[PDB]
Amino acid sequence: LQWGHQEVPAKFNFASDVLDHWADMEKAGKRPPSPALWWVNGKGKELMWNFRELSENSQQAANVLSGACGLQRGDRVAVVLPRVPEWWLVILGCIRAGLIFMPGTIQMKSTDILYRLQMSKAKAIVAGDEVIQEVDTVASECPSLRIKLLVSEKSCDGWLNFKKLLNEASTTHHCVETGSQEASAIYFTSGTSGLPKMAEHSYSSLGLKAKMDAGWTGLQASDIMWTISDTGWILNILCSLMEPWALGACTFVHLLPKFDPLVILKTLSSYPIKSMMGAPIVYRMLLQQDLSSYKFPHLQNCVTVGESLLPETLENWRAQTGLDIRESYGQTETGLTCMVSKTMKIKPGYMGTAASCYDVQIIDDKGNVLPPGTEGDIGIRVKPIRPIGIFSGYVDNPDKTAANIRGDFWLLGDRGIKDEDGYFQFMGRADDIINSSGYRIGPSEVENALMEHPAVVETAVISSPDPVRGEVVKAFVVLASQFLSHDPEQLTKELQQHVKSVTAPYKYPRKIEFVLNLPKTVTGKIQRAKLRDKEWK
Amino acid sequence: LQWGHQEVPAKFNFASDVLDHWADMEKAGKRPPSPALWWVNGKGKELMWNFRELSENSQQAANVLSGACGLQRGDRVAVVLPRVPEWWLVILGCIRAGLIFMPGTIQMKSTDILYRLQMSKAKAIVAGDEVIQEVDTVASECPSLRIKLLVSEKSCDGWLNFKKLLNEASTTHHCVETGSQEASAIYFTSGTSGLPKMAEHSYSSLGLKAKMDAGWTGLQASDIMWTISDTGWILNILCSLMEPWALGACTFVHLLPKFDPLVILKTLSSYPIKSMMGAPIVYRMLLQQDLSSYKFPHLQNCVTVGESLLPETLENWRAQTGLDIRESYGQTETGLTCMVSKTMKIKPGYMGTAASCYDVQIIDDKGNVLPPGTEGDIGIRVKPIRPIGIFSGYVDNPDKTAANIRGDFWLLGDRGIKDEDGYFQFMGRADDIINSSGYRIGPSEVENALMEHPAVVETAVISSPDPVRGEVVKAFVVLASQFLSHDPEQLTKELQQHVKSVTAPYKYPRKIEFVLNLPKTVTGKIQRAKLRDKEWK
Amino acid sequence: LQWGHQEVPAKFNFASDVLDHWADMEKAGKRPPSPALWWVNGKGKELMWNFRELSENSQQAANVLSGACGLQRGDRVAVVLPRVPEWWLVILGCIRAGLIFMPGTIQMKSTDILYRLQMSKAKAIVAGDEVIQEVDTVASECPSLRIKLLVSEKSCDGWLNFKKLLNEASTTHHCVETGSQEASAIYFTSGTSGLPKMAEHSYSSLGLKAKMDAGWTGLQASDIMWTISDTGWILNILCSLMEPWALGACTFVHLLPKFDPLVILKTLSSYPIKSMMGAPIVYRMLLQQDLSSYKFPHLQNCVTVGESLLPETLENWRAQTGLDIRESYGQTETGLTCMVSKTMKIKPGYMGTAASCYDVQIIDDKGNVLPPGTEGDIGIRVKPIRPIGIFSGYVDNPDKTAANIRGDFWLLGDRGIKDEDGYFQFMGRADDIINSSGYRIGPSEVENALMEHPAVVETAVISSPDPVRGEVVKAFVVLASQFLSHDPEQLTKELQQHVKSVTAPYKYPRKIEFVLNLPKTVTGKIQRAKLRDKEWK
């Protein structure tokens, strides 16, 4: 592999190279104790760590994982937690202990969990009260799974008490001398067909890339950033963790147990958050609140990712707050790929210019660069030199990795147009992936869930336009002859509840259309593009 | 004149006959919007026109020239611009408006400009920031000069703002019904003695000739060609403009502000350029770069003109890239005269066979055809029928035109040998013209510059062999007795700087030899041939 | 793996980094054309390459391999050639083309070859007339084997003509940008039990290690070295190739078709060889010749490896020639491990001090360092940092690699004592490996060969002391009851011929003892140590 070769130091570790620099600055008296992590639950509990405390407590976390739990360098650890401090501590702990962290959403059902534990052959899971039961439904079928660590006020037979072990642990752990290319994280990522793939990131593709992008958000050393994210998304590691800590800035975490926009607004108004990051829906939701009542003159930087930002949202936000929203763009495999930086003119409807050292282009069917103003596929040049930030590949599936390289370019799977200044406009997914709010949904995940129901003999799942949410999961369902006599509204509701019971509810089909047939290729494949084309005007 | 008579239609215009065919194909839906002009500055700005846009924008250009500027059919327009899109637009505009365009290099000094404006009696000049000051030094002495159009981000008192007028102009202009033999361009061309002559080309000698040669380069309709040229050279009109547009292909333009070979290499590697054209120096420079690092597997056709291609350059290029270089040959008066086409065997050291409908021969002192393997003068048969592509003659100087006809043959002024297959080998200039890289230098231009200095009482300028550049300008200088005590290296440097200050720097004498005398004919002419003979071994 | 981590540049390639430096020095005029390879056949043919010619001709070799043969980066190439220039060219060619070369001896029989081709899944073999027939006996059973390249004056159906393709090939090849840790060579190496393992070396463990040791032999830039070696031994790559070429010195190769000591002596006397390297047997053989008749006052450096140098050989050599022999020590996995350098006092019976950056120690059963004067196992410290020069591991067998690490130390498998100055004395093999002259013999290889014969129902192969050769292969053979009536001298001769017919003849048992039984552990293993102990007094 020319792919494995990069322009990187032999060794890199975000914890020892970045976080412990700040800890050492404090200890040496060269910087005052500076807030690193500020967590609130919105019910009167708050916690704050400075960089020395964060380093000490994450060293304890690494001692729990490597010492009490006996996990060894290279072991894979599923992490499925709400927005609690232990998420940040445990990730840092894995980084310190040379363990591969694998974040997932607390929305996951038992089948989602079993798929991931079996595929990854995880040695450990760190979970909270939200998924303990779902984990225990399937853990017996996971022969590799040896450690269950629970983050909770409760104890549970079979699970180790993370919070108790952390307090018992030493605040000294010797950071593993991890290699730049060594596996650090696995993120499961949905595909255009089939079930989620394991996208492997290295110590450098996450942490060195973040160190190089540090400040892209407008954030500075003495500021506070609030990234609003599910802890399972790669957004959480890149923006909630690595962006602020590369700068020695504070990251702000609200438990946000119900995603309540009035709570978000009161939080912005009551805490001195200078920068925020959330998906476009966050800003859309906030705009439906009374912004006149909860001012936030301390807020300066508003960034977004995950779905295209409507010029209308941008307009309304500027009108109600006086602030810009600066769009960014990326995927799990590539991290931050394009963005509008704090010094760039904003062009409504465009998501900015190439990030970092990426050579991002619009390319043709042959993999050749197209001129400005021509629609094609968005790619990043990865040959002959793979830039810092691109993932290591799909785990156990180098053919899938190679499949997505066209000529010298990694394909994002998005259509786009580049203007005369190099700014990109998103022109839609080039494949069958569905983007519902932040979430990336593979149609086979949803089709499979539906097919389990006895009513469904065939189904195609596509994206569908929505006025409030933008894009939703829609299912075309062919019924067993027996269910033709059933009330469609009743059966739709039943099918939706079924999908929500069996897989993470964010994937459920908000729209179901019953049909007698679905269009087929001569190989018998459903023509989703054809259905999507009709569906979107 | 039997000379004026040709086998041509009564009317021809490249813009209406060729360019607007492609524009109309797009508009009619018979061809998809196809790239015509793709310009980059190498700092992140790119612009592309399709054939409809190119036609619209050049119609605007013609409206600026004929409408806002009041220029009338037959008016002569000096064009002195860098490699910016407005060069292509303005030339097309002149073609549309039946205006005689007269390109020159941005390397020109005020004296060069005044000579050309006064000789031509130009009504207009189109210039950029590179020469505005030089133009303004002398414009008051040019009574015919009425319009100064500046292509710039700046405005300047006395100059019309081309870019602003173009945007204000209509995209509809009715193309002048120009005659086949009507003057379209004047190119100033250096002579063996004296100062540059005005070589007049017609609508047909440029555009119909190009239409007939279309594809000689190997270029096809859906390809991109990069011709690397000074915009003042006739090479730019024939290969950067007319060759690709006769085919409906895209022409690629890089500003290339510094002629940086690493920039050329990165450009070849990063853009899907299928054909390239440059003088041999371009390929020589590229060969000194790391071609292993910047591959260009999309490149298929490499053509050259302007200086003889060393078999060594040909060899090295094939070794490092796997590609041939196909040589071509021509002069300002004749356009493309010989070449190696894409289907011809390459014979190293030969420049191919007669182009187009040219009867190219080696001829004797009487104007008779010589057998293969005999050195003589290269000529094109122009009587009794002057072939399409030969210029109309030297403006105001029909005696100079006639002087260069020997029997039935136009003399190229080069020596050559023709082989058994009709392939020509260049055997050197037959006169005192100096060829330094692409540039054709008349010795009187350089001698005159030198004589202006008080040290120089006599001088002869000849070509001299050079290992790196091939051929250079050398001056023999007889000193005023007063300067005999001066340090020669100091005075050489001073004389070189003087020549560079007074005339386009490409002509400067890279070598100066101080001598006490120069050999004279009985008419008192310096014997340059004698000096050149000694100089070249 | 902390093992994979090293203090090395990301990229290394001996050909581009070392050899092409010397080639470029010549081309740039900064060094005169300097001999690189001087080959003689001892019948009046000689050939010499300078560094430019060596680079050109090896670039041709790389073009044969990658171009004509279509071999791709990472493909494995068996090389089985006599001492001809094409060995050096082909190895360099593989290095340039990022191909894994796998040298073996021309003494190999068809079964030896099939084992290696099947184990390695080689895509190609480069062979000469010595093994073509043996290769063709088994090549059909090697589904991965696609290319057979023959180095010969003859052509053979099925084999490509290497010498013809090389001459047809371009002298320009763009060196692959190989990684420091990327596989460069596989050497098959015998084990204490079972059949030979694949020892993988990297671009850096061979070439960067050699660059760092360059000159250990006493060799300088303007000298000639003669390494006397089978081309299959790692000695050939480290000392015949990399040591002289790291220095810009000449390597001298004599075909030496019969290993004739009078030929070696006449060669030393007739050519200005300043340094020589051979196994102790070379010097022993030379000492039986008339050194008074063939003086070599130009010879300055005599080095040895492969078997312990008797103080008697050292003494006799000094007495007859006035020269020292400087001992070195290493194995396939470790390269040059200890040696007596040109500035070190020679202590008869000791093999010098740790090479390069190796921390070489005598260690106990726990892996702890022992004091001077205590016998233990020779080890190299490989944790936490594996030094440059240690191989990458056994291919497909990381458990075998790990098996030989005791604590933080790679085990050489030799016993030794270290003196107060750090000099090591060899105290014998710690396992069942047999060292006969240069050759390392695994007993299972020989036992297996013998067991194929119907007379042999059981056998143990051990080392045995020999006055002339030092150590020989001895077989204990238990006979089938049917062969008890056979003449032992006849049957011994027959068994020896059998072993020589089926496997490389260097392994054959020079001594056979017929016995009625062999001592067994409670697991039923033959106690070879017990037999060897009795055998050696």
Ligand SMILES: [Cl-]
């Ligand atoms: Cl909105």
Ligand SMILES: [Cl-]
């Ligand atoms: Cl406001």
Ligand SMILES: [Cl-]
């Ligand atoms: Cl997701």
Ligand SMILES: [Cl-]
């Ligand atoms: Cl590139």
Ligand SMILES: [Cl-]
């Ligand atoms: Cl050259």
Ligand SMILES: [Cl-]
């Ligand atoms: Cl090539």
Ligand SMILES: [Cl-]
């Ligand atoms: Cl005729």
Ligand SMILES: [Cl-]
């Ligand atoms: Cl010119």
Ligand SMILES: [Cl-]
């Ligand atoms: Cl001896």
Ligand SMILES: [Cl-]
């Ligand atoms: Cl002696």
Ligand SMILES: [Cl-]
């Ligand atoms: Cl140590």
Ligand SMILES: [Cl-]
């Ligand atoms: Cl061996």
Ligand SMILES: [Mg+2]
């Ligand atoms: Mg069903």
Ligand SMILES: [Mg+2]
């Ligand atoms: Mg003068």
Ligand SMILES: [Mg+2]
């Ligand atoms: Mg037997």
